[PDB]
Amino acid sequence: GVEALEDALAQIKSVNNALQERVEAVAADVRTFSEGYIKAIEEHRDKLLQQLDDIRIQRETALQLQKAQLEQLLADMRTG
Amino acid sequence: GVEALEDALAQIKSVNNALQERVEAVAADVRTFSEGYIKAIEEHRDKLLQQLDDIRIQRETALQLQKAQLEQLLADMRTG
Amino acid sequence: GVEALEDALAQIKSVNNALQERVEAVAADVRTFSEGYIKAIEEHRDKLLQQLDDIRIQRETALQLQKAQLEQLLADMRTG
Amino acid sequence: GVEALEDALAQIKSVNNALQERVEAVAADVRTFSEGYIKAIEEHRDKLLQQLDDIRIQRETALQLQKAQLEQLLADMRTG
């Protein structure tokens, strides 16, 4: 009778509860993934930038050891 | 043998400017990707968080409306 | 004299080894990152695609439970 | 009070199509984003992998050219 109305009414309030749970959860995940993602990008971007700078630097150095080892040979000629 | 070496020098010198530029370019793109990428990740996170919101809003309103409806019977059945 | 020419020649031949290793490493990493990413994207795209499917399902069922609970009432009326 | 419940029924029916669509569309986006993300990661890896490669070529050939140049002196000094 009026029994069944108050039931359907309590169910609705709960079957809704559990659906909002599912949505918040999905939203939580989107946030987790999106945060974790951006981070991993920054880290990886940094490493790469780092290694490029080391390439830039280990190169200027090699340049010099040649540039020099060569001006030695020049001298070795112009002299003895 | 002198002029020879004067040359090896000039060669070493200008092979360097070139490889310098290139590395600087890789680094540039390494930058550009990450801002673009992090932009997109953000944009999309938002668009998804938004529709997830709309699902909630839409379902809540239908709850409120439906509750209101069955609340009315609830009174009109308490006597009515 | 000729001593110092084969040194500079073993230098360049070695200093290149080191620069290749460096560039190799970089590209190695670009590889793992992109691979690592694409995985993560697939995994999250899947988990999401999955939770949303659960949301339709868990919704269809809430619907039917309501509909059915309502028709019960509508009948409780038409009869006793 | 039948009509009331005949009404709830119809409301439930119509709320549900709407919430179906919205969840569909959410999922449609989850699909498209991963296609973009994945696609353009891959473009990038390729772009960078290419340039790293060119750094290699540009250096490799400069080495070849320099090697050849100093190989010659080596001969023209191993006699005169």
Nearest CA in chain B to D44: B33
Question: Could you give the C-alpha distances from C34 to B41, C41, D44, in angstroms and in order?
Answer: 15, 10, 9
- Please name the member of C8, C33, C41 whose beta carbon is closest to the beta carbon of D38: C41
Burial profile B19-57: b = 16 or more Cβ within 10 angstroms, e = fewer: beebbeebbeebeebbeebbeebeebbeebeebbeebee
**Exposed, middle or buried: residue A29 (CB in 10 Å: 0-12, 13-18, 19+)?**
middle
Measure the CA–CA gap between B33 and D49, rounded to whole angstroms: 14
Question: Among A71, A48, A38, which Cα is nearest to B26's?
Answer: A48
- Residue A56's alpha-carbon distances to A2, A59, C17, C18, D10, in angstroms, are 81, 5, 15, 13, 70
Query: Measured between CB atoms, which of C26, C55, C70 is closest to A22?
Result: C55
CB contact under 8 A, B11 and D66: yes
When CB atoms are compared, the residue of D38, D52, D71 closest to C26 is D52
Residue C27 CA to chain centroid, in angstroms? 20
Reading the block at residue A69, the tokens are 């080892």
Q: Closest to B30 (Cβ–Cβ): which among A5, A31, A52?
A: A52
Residue A68 to chain C, least CA–CA distance (Å): 10
Gap between the terminal Cα atoms of chain D: 118
Give the Cα separation of D43 and D50 in Å (integer): 11
Q: How far does the CA of residue C67 sit from the closest CA of chain D (Å)?
A: 6
End-to-end CA distance of chain A: 119
Rg of chain A (C-alpha set): 35
Measured in residues, chain B has a length of 80
State how far the alpha carbon of D69 is from the alpha carbons of B1, B37, C5, D72, in Å: 11, 46, 11, 5
In contact, B53 and D24? CB cutoff 8 Å: no
Q: Is the dihedral of CA D62, D64, D70, D73 positive or negative?
A: negative
Q: Under an 8 A CB cutoff, do C1 and D74 touch?
A: no
The rounded distance, in Å, linking the Cα atoms of C74 and D6 is 8
Three-state DSSP state, C37:
helix
Distance separating alpha carbons of residues C45 and C35, to the nearest angstrom? 15
CA-derived radius of gyration, chain D: 35
Q: Do D48 and B26 touch (CB under 8 A)?
A: yes
How would you write A3-18 as a 3-class SS string?
Answer: HHHHHHHHHHHHHHHH
Q: What is the DSSP letter of A80?
A: -
- Counting one residue from chain A and one from chain C, the pairs whose CB atoms sit within 8 A come to 86
Declared resolution, Å: 2.7
- Say what the alpha-carbon torsion angle B34, B36, B39, B44 is, to the nearest 10 degrees: -110
Experimental approach taken = X-ray
* Chain C contact set for D20 (CB, 8 A): 56, 59
Using an 8 Å Cβ cutoff, are C27 and D56 in contact?
A: no
Tokens of A32: 């987790």
What's the rounded Cα separation, in Å, for the pair B70 and D4?
A: 9
Q: Nearest Cα to A37, choosing from D38, B52, D32, C54?
A: D38
- Interface of chain D against chain C, CB under 8 Å? 1-2, 5-6, 8-9, 12-13, 16, 19-20, 23, 26-27, 30-31, 33-34, 37-38, 41-42, 44-45, 48-49, 52-53, 55-56, 59, 63, 66-67, 70-71, 73-74, 77-78
Q: What is the DSSP letter of D78?
A: S
- Residue from D61, B1, C11 nearest A65 by CA: C11
R_g of chain B, CA atoms, integer Å: 35
Question: Best mutation site among A16, A22, A56 for testing chain C: the one with the most C CBs within 10 Å?
Answer: A22
Least CB–CB distance from D2: residue in C9, C55, C74: C74
Q: Are B24 and A56 a contacting pair at CB < 8 A?
A: yes
Name which of D6, D46, D64, D69 to mutate to probe chain B: the one with the most chain B Cβ atoms within 10 A of its Cβ: D69
